[PDB]
Design a protein around this ligand. Structure first.
Ligand SMILES: NCCc1ccc(S(=O)(=O)F)cc1
Length: 330
């Protein structure tokens, strides 16, 4: 089996990407945020506190002939940005891009934080990290990928995120037309439940490459690139007028700037993030201060290769017995 679905940025900044997912019988299509940094498939639902729903499409299990309550199961999750949701659990048929899983745990939100309510374009999350992070209690549940894995032609999925454009999530195959050159694979640690890997270093613009190990996670659910303070200072030092603002909550730069590229290492290979990708536009509407797409991971406790980095590459999430990540230019 394979699946292939288009993923679409939610706004002009590429703040997140949504992918249509069919749930239930007859199908209920919800637009979910595919998140390689978490392991819960949760949705806005007919159970979500009415005051916390603002435009989202909801899943109504009572309208699905295949929905089953997973009796006694609850879930509760918190994300690195302070958002959260919780609720109860159904099993149902879930399809992504033509790939179907029966008996998938669909976590129905009773509560979501304000950040989810205020984002009308995201109907829930589909976690793609390791199932050891799944929050369902008392019986932990598997991710859509882990349930699909044995059926897939190859135990892989790929992320091909667009810059200000749609992209693709594929399951079970590697589209050799979707990238240039070769794919460089690198080791993954599953010890923290993430797609955790070690970059071999970085360069700023046309500068020399600095060989240095940077542990971090490949996270499609995080917008920006979060790296050590040393690395981030070295990047923004090349932008006249850039500074870290405690009032705004990170590095800002004059909107009149042209940003340098940022290169990160994958083994002996190099992925170049164009400078344009690092522009997140005015900090408030009409401002001449712009928000940076490379920020410090200080305080977060992990480095995060979020969408700013991942969208510069074709990314293979290899879920074989020994997991690996692959990166190619595109
Ligand atoms: N891996 C990060 C998952 C995540 C965490 C928070 C959101 S948000 O829409 O509330 F900003 C979205 C996705």
């Amino acid at each position: 089996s394979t699946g292939s679905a288009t993923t679409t940025p939610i706004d002009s900044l590429d703040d997140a990407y949504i992918t249509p997912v069919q749930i239930g019988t007859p199908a209920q299509t919800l637009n979910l945020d595919f998140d390689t940094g978490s392991s819960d498939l949760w949705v806005f639902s007919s159970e979500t506190t009415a005051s916390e729903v603002d435009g989202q499409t909801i899943y109504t299990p009572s309208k699905s002939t295949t929905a089953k309550l997973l009796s006694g199961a609850t879930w509760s999750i918190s994300y690195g940005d302070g958002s959260s949701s919780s609720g109860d659990v159904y099993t149902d048929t879930v399809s992504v891009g033509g790939l179907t899983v029966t008996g998938q745990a669909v976590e129905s939100a009773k509560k979501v934080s304000s950040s989810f309510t205020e984002d009308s374009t995201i109907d829930g999350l589909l976690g793609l990290a390791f199932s050891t992070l799944n929050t369902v209690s008392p019986t932990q549940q598997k991710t859509f990928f882990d349930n699909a894995k044995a059926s897939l032609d190859s135990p892989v999925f790929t992320a091909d995120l667009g810059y200000h454009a749609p992209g693709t999530y594929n399951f079970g195959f590697i589209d050799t037309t979707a990238y240039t050159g070769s794919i460089t694979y690198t080791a993954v640690s599953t010890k923290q439940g993430f797609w955790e890997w070690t970059s071999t270093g970085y360069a700023v613009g046309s500068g020399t490459f600095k060989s240095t190990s940077i542990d971090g996670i490949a996270d499609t659910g995080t917008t920006l690139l979060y790296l050590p303070a040393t690395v981030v200072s070295a990047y923004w030092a090349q932008v006249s007028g850039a500074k870290s603002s405690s009032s705004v909550g990170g590095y800002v730069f004059p909107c009149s700037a042209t940003l340098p590229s940022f290169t990160f290492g994958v083994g002996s290979a190099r992925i170049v993030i164009p400078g344009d990708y690092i522009d997140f536009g005015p900090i408030s509407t009409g401002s001449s201060s712009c928000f940076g797409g490379i920020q410090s991971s200080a305080g977060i406790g992990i480095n995060i290769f979020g969408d700013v980095a991942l969208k510069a590459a074709f990314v293979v999430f290899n879920g074989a017995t020994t997991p690996t990540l692959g990166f190619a230019s595109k």
